[PDB]
Design a protein around this ligand. Sequence first.
Ligand SMILES: [Ca+2]
Ligand SMILES: [Ca+2]
Ligand SMILES: [Ca+2]
Ligand SMILES: [Ca+2]
Lengths: 553, 553
Amino acid sequence: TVPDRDNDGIPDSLEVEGYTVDVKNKRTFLSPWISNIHEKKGLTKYKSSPEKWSTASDPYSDFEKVTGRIDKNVSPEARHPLVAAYPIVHVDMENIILSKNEDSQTRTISKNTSTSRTHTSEVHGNAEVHASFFDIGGSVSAGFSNSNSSTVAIDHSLSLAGERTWAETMGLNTADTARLNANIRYVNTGTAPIYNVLPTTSLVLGKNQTLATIKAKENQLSQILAPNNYYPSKNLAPIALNAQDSSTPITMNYNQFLELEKTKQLRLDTDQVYGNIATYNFENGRVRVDTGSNWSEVLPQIQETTARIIFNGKDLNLVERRIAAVNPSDPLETTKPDMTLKEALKIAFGFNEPNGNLQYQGKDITEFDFNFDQQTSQNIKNQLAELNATNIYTVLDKIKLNAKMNILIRDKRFHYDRNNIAVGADESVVKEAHREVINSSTEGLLLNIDKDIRKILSGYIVEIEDTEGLKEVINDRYDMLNISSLRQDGKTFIDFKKYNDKLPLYISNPNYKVNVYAVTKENTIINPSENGDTSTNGIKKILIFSKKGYEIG
Amino acid sequence: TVPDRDNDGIPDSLEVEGYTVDVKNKRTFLSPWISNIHEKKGLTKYKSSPEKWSTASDPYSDFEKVTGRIDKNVSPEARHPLVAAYPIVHVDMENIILSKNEDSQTRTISKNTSTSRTHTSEVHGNAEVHASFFDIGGSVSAGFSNSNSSTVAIDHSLSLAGERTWAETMGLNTADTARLNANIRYVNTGTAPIYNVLPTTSLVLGKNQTLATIKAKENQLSQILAPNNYYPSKNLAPIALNAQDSSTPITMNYNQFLELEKTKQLRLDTDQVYGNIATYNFENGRVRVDTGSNWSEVLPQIQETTARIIFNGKDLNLVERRIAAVNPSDPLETTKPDMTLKEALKIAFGFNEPNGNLQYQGKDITEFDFNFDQQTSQNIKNQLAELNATNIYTVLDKIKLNAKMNILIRDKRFHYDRNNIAVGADESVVKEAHREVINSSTEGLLLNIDKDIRKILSGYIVEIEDTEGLKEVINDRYDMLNISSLRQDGKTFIDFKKYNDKLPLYISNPNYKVNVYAVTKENTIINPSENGDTSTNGIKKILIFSKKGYEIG
Ligand SMILES: [Ca+2]
Ligand SMILES: [Ca+2]
Ligand SMILES: [Ca+2]
Ligand SMILES: [Ca+2]
């Protein structure tokens, strides 16, 4: 009569004091922690709640997880009892194509786009918010809350000849209407797979101008949207918007269009209506989809009993993950094991302990900026109070975590915008990343630029300095910055030629200086100034390259 | 064979005499009250009925609640056995847009709106009511009864240039028809979440002119309408009326329109057809939606066995909550624990006992006005009789509560209208709240105005007094009061500039007086007098600011 209140399979004693699953001959034993023999083999000290089926609340029993008798598609780190295993799906727009609503073969602009999961944070301290902002639950979005929003930025450069004025290039006048079309793909950033129904993501423009809502039919798809995997597998045909399937295309009047040309960006607000869930079956050991248990029902619970932490180390992409945090008010939830901001980061993402420090694959914890909400803030400030210390990174392994807590560990190296996106770092860094020259030619530059940094650079600027001090720039236009291409060999490649009429640079005197600059996204522009200054005049460029002419080719 | 008639899980003895749930190691124990050790740890003395599953009648077992093995979305205070845990959803209209039913880019008026849950109370003592008002159950609305009604007020100010006459601004004549459109969002004020089906709320105008009934399709939504949470999360795209989804727009003939322009307000009568309910499952511990148990069935019961109290402390918003009140006639309902108007207020909202007094987060109970219905009135008056006392606030912890009883505890500081809405307080208060000046400029005023009070002020008036006694007002129009904007830093900001042509004030003599007044909603007007007096002449303004010219900038 071994005690098991949750009836999960893991006896209370274990679930509460500690345990781990291990394999003897070929069989697997669920044994209690043994600092002696266990820590050696490499196992893990699993500690869950004895009174809950799945301590996270997600559709997977603490037993099912640790043991491995679960939907193999569930994320690894989510295989751990205190790591919420749910989906997180947003939409990526690879590129778009704009034209005139119905001899139309050269009257169109097809430019690419860059999309990223956004995490819109509150304003400054003087926004005209309605008097309902200071009420309970109402308007108090508290910085960041549950929901999906991806922001697309459209390529401002040039694709054709010497094209100019998006408007005329298409042939648009106050009495015309421009139609939009694009290629997108759903992408699951979460820790659990979606099996059928897809999110009814809507495309917004500006602040509330809903351009269209894509709700690609249900069950039409049987392909799985596994964690870290794009809907139509990156090696397949992306989904196109209002390009087939649909009788009502996309309408965008003049005024609206102008705005698009003004910011050259859109937003993708996606809901959470994911499909039913795939559950295990102890009987035959097959994973099936329970037409009864659908995420929309099981998600809230997770969200109401987990510490959520957003992090961007793996890549400058925001990653969400929830940990099994406790809660004073809820007796049951007070059964969940105690959570430390340290341990959280260890299993929630991957941080580890080398020789005593807490770093994330090299980068030390101290290299990231912690961000919370009003609630979480206090709840922590008050813990630092009763522990006497000002530098949190010290007591990091003593900061208790409670459910409903929201955290945002981000890389300190870069600057971020409203949507907490990487926008560009300090000079000291940008240079430090270009300190590797491979091939110097009058055609371009080949470097071993750091995959990360480069993601914060709009483009480059190439000029030539006279022996006395001149400023002649080859690509002298706001939209002639797009030059750095990326080879699959893992090396960034610049090309002066693309914007010099197929022909290489011009060395008037092999004693001159060939300058190349980088333009961070936060400093780069997308349109001519008030007048019509279409030149790299008023730009905050950066000294990336500066070698003589006899040191190239 | 421990006795459990309700078969809930809590043994009679406990349920009747007292108990509380607590956590030992990581397990949770359901133990009886122990004034000694319990009161210390901070637990609560739970006392429910031994013969009822859920003493409130709501879909949640007394056990499920106290223990926490329930839909995590259920409100906290409703986690207590004697606090009805049901939904309460009304509709908020952020703003509207009026035009002429079909070169229409400058022939429209888009003004914002302010909506609030109303609690329409009876008339005075001379209303022409049909002879059926004094019958049983018939017409005896008894002051306030179950149902949802939200009142919207439309911004009367100006948005464009020097616009005038709503009629002509759109181009309306006896032979034309104006169409309406607006953005709204459902909002759940209750204590329990709705999971799918949404209320068939209808938009009324005046007294019975049903403008349109919005019944946004069922199951189309899977997003949850949690307690204190707006339908499309405040951080999302509000729902628009007859703007897509719909073939029959909104029609409003001349006569009707005029009325709108006359009171500039509408009403939103919403039903209670909420969705099915989310119930817990002891087995695996998952929360699912029982296609069998739908609120429409489970609500009545609550309503017929609970003391309902409306309160507005959290904010000047009416909050409804029901407590497990007893009932003499019903044997079963006579099993419910005894309820005191004190305890009720303690768990129903949050009132507590500091050093012996009963206050609600600072404000003392004595600062609110108690309001009942004919029935509840007597039932209490008769309790004061057999207890010899005239001041109720004394015997507050001795006023028994019976089911079907209706109560309305409201803040005494302000004045209220028909719908029991905050409309404006006494002078002594308005001033007291503006006793904090931060930045004085010839452009505007920055103050630390109390979030609460400000919610009762239509706008401000700015004039200049000569050294002898002149009355020159900058913004001298009924609709030029809208000036106080609110910064997210938590400070109210006034702007003289908005109504002085972008340019700051004019100090003819730095020894003059710069006056600023506030206009309470109850005193403010929305249209020109009989003739055409579009000036702040006949208005009951209030002395808010009065500083010299050399004490500003
Ligand atoms: Ca267990
Ligand atoms: Ca368990
Ligand atoms: Ca019982
Ligand atoms: Ca009971």
